[PDB]
């Protein structure tokens, strides 16, 4: 093996400007990092800059450097959708024709009718909302009628809330599994179905840790599957295991924040493994992009950048660090959906003694999966061109 360990970091939703097919998605003008940089009157990301971020694209506060620490380029998405699952599945070697859907106006009547018909239960709500807001509004009605609160959010999700003392937890899970089956349908293909049990009394409802997520398996065996099948370590950090429904994962480390994510990354640097450590930093997407909060997004990017020198210090000669994103989510864009953007790619190993150079633009996110597969000598994905030899 060229590299004993590969550290792959997805900065979730951190796009680097509209992709050539942005118009199809209503995403003309989108630019996640660029608009944030402008809002911040110059982004302070000196460590990403040292890696070559400004060499990919110069933006306010983000300038090119003569000798980038590693190699740099951007990647174009080939799959139809701009959702988290599509982006991650593509990164790990797949091509996804069928997009997952988002539902800003709630779910189609046909889906909800069928869910009632299979469960013998009434459905109420049917709109985007946070868990606190929807429970405040409908929690009492739910308790009194035994109905099911169905709701969505900014992402591709179908959420079902029921009081634990009115709808037995085990029944709520059965209902969610039925909904998971009904949503395997391109007319209304949702990324995940989520059980949202809650307890308490009107004016004091709280969601319990009995939450359960029902994910789809990737539409293909991924590079992660191949690594796991060859007895390599595949350490998933943050939402990674959920995103892939555990496929190809040997260890999973839950995180509660971006900084906790960087702490777990550090934990894996301190582990003797051979294979892949795969981190998703989700705050960018969940707290800032969808909420259209460029200030919060800018601050999070700066907090993340400040953590990188410790990572640089810990990387061994036979370690490779890969930093990318899975789509854009421009916090100064109309609506609440993701944005169809190129994503940055930075590839750094301390063994790169004379620094990096520009890579040819990656025609699919699957170039990452191809590179990882080639490094570890496992079956090459059907899509993607390795850049291993360029490093
Ligand atoms: O319902 P919450 O707590 O406001 O969470 C928002 C989204 C819904 C599911 C996950 O994407 O997080
Ligand atoms: Mn748009
Ligand atoms: Mn994402
Ligand atoms: Mn999202």
338 is an annotated ligand-binding site residue: yes
To test the pocket of ligand 1, the residue of 153, 156, 191 to mutate (highest count of ligand atoms within 8 Å of its CB) is 153
327 is an annotated ligand-binding site residue: yes
Residue nearest to atom 7 of ligand 1 (CA): 153
Give me the domains of the chain, ranges plus CATH numbers: 1-97+217-391 (3.40.720.10), 98-216 (3.30.70.1250)
Residue nearest to atom 8 of ligand 1 (CA): 153
Q: Which ligand approaches the C-alpha of residue 334 most closely?
A: 2
Closest approach atom of ligand 1 to CA 152: 8
Residues flanking ligand 1, CB < 6 Å: 130-131, 153, 155, 157, 194
285 is an annotated ligand-binding site residue: yes
Rounded CA separation 230/373 (Å): 11
CB 223 within 8 A of CB 369: yes
Q: How was this structure determined?
A: X-ray
CB 45 within 8 A of CB 301: yes
């Amino acid at each position: 093996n060229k590299y004993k360990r590969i550290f792959l970091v997805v900065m979730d939703s951190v796009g680097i400007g509209e992709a050539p097919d942005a118009e199809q998605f209503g995403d003309l003008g989108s630019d996640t990092i660029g608009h944030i940089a402008e809002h911040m009157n110059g982004l302070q990301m000196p460590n990403m800059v040292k890696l070559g971020l400004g060499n990919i694209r110069e933006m306010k506060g983000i300038s090119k450097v003569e000798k980038p620490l590693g190699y740099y380029t951007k990647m174009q998405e080939k799959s139809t959708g701009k959702d988290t699952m599509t982006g991650h599945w593509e990164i790990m070697g797949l091509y996804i024709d069928t997009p997952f859907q988002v539902f800003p106006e709630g779910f189609p009547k046909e889906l909800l009718d069928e869910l009632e018909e299979k469960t013998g239960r009434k459905i109420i709500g049917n709109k985007p909302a946070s868990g606190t807001e929807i429970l405040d509004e409908l929690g009492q009605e739910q308790m009194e009628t035994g109905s099911l609160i169905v709701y969505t959010g900014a992402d591709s999700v179908l959420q079902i809330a029921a009081h634990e003392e009115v709808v037995p937890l085990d029944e709520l899970y059965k209902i969610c599994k039925i909904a998971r089956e009904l949503t395997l349908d391109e007319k209304y293909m949702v990324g995940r179905v989520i059980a949202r049990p809650f307890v308490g009394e009107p004016g004091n409802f709280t969601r319990t840790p009995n939450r359960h997520d029902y994910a789809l398996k990737p539409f293909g065996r991924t590079v992660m599957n191949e690594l796991k099948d060859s007895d390599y370590d595949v350490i998933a950090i943050g939402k990674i295991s959920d995103i892939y429904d555990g496929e190809g994962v040997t260890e999973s480390l839950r995180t509660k924040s971006n900084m906790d994510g960087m702490d777990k990354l550090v934990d894996t640097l301190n582990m003797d493994f051979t294979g892949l450590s795969f981190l998703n930093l989700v705050d960018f997407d969940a707290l800032f992009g969808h909420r259209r909060d460029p200030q919060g997004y800018g601050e999070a990017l700066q907090e993340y950048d400040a953590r990188l020198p410790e990572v640089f210090a810990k990387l061994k000669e036979d370690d490779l660090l890969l930093i990318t994103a899975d789509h854009g989510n421009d916090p100064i864009h109309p609506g609440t959906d993701h944005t169809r953007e190129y994503v940055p790619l930075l590839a750094y190993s301390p063994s790169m003694k004379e620094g990096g150079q520009e890579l040819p633009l990656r025609q699919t996110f699957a170039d990452i999966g191809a590179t990882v597969a080639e490094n570890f000598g496992v079956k090459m994905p059907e899509y993607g061109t390795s850049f291993l030899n360029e490093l």
